Structure 1
Amino acid sequence: LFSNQIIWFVDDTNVYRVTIHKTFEGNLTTKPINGAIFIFNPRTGQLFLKIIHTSVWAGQKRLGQLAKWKTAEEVAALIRSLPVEEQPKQIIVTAKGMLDPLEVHLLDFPNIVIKGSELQLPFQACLKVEKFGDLILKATEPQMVLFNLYDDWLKTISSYTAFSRLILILRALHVNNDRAKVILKPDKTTITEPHHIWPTLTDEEWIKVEVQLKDLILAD
């Protein structure tokens, strides 16, 4: 996972999003809201966030199915925009419905291996992190935004350790957002830098946090 080969995880979970409301007449209305594709490099921490504006669905039906195809289209478009040296060698998807769309969209890229995964990597949780949630909510058109999901961690820990830390954060936020946010703020003075995603914590603080997040996930 952290070798010389560029690897991307691709998450389509958040592409097609809706709000459901029961009207005064007793029927359900379903209205799309903006979504996002998450494309993540586990070695470097790079995230490509492709915001999906609701206008893309105009006209269309079976939007949850079409979202798999839209995701594959956008992955291919990103790849086309990158020099060959920056293109991934492997694309890993935790949703099985992404496999066939990606295969058909990436026929011009014979070097790229597509595989499925049973890992729990819930980028959905990022919608709970104000930076991402508000950006996605308020967008008025599609756009791509770059992030570094490991902040400054790699100065002192390995990619393996950083990946493990990130997964514990995402899973804990997914399972119990309120308690995870408390765990991640151990002191009144804990802050997150404006250009960071996650709090600035000491090594001792991260040790305790990681154990607490793991325990939270186990308690579900």
Structure 2
Amino acid sequence: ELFSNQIIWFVDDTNVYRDTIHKTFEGNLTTKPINGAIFIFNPRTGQLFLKIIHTSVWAGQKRLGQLAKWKTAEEVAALIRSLPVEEQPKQIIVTRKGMLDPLEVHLLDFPNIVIKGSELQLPFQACLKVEKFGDLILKATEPQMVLFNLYDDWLKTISSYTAFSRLILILRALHVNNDRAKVILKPDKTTITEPHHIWPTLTDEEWIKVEVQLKDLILAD
């Protein structure tokens, strides 16, 4: 399925509508939208299209959580239209079932694209506390798209399958227990992440140990 000659995108809309809530001194709830993002991810190549969603899009609107699914579908369609046909996905896998109907209705001009849901646990939400992404999203003053390579230099020495599995363990572990996962991912005082990389520079042996530890962290839940 994944990794063939077919271009596949995972689309995660979870983080499009975000807010903070607090109690006023008068005892009422204040809900303040904050910037969000769509994650559109190619598991073969590691390519991420990060569409930052600025809070201005919600101006004058209600039911923002529901509207966000439709915004997501509109943005996926716009991205597809901006790409040459040879770069357009053959399959889009939505991580949440609420995306199925909105995306169906917005992709009617793309009969070659198959849309399906998934039960896979792919928490791109964890990226919001990876500082690179977190501050970029927080501080944006308008919508924009940013490209990333979520596999860093891994594909020089491992397959797409291996890289995808590593990424998922990282994201799930960060999701389950951010603080512990970050410790696991920094095995040495001298462990660094390159400025243009997302993840640390680790030896092959270090990654073996990391992968087991991340898996165990996810199991411990």
TM-score, normalized by length of structure 1? 1.00
Deviation of residue 65 (structure 1)?
0.3
SS across alignment from 1:108: coil
SS across alignment from 1:124: helix
Deviation of residue 216 (structure 1)?
0.2
Distance 2:161 2:36 in 1: 29
Distance 1:23 1:97 in 2: 33
Q: CA RMSD in A?
A: 0.3
Distance 1:135 1:128 in 2: 11
- String of CA shifts for 1:153-173, please: whole Å, max 9, x gaps: 000000000000000000000
Deviation of residue 94 (structure 1)?
1.4
- String of CA shifts for 1:111-168, please: whole Å, max 9, x gaps: 0000000000000000010000000000000000000000000000000000000000
Distance 1:94 1:112 in 2: 16
Deviation of residue 215 (structure 1)?
0.1
- String of CA shifts for 1:59-106, please: whole Å, max 9, x gaps: 100000000000000000000000000000000011000000000000
TM-score, normalized by length of structure 2? 0.99
Distance 2:20 2:67 in 1: 18
Deviation of residue 48 (structure 1)?
0.1
Distance 2:124 2:53 in 1: 15
Query: 2:128: which partner in 1?
Result: 127
Runs of 4+ in 1 over 2 A off after TM superposition: none
- String of CA shifts for 1:5-41, please: whole Å, max 9, x gaps: 0000000000000010111111111010000000000
Distance 1:10 1:163 in 2: 15
How many residue pairs align between the two structures? 220
SS across alignment from 2:145: strand
Task: State, as a whole percentage, how many aligned pairs show the same letter.
Answer: 99
SS across alignment from 2:26: coil
SS across alignment from 1:104: helix
Distance 1:117 1:128 in 2: 24
Deviation of residue 208 (structure 1)?
0.1
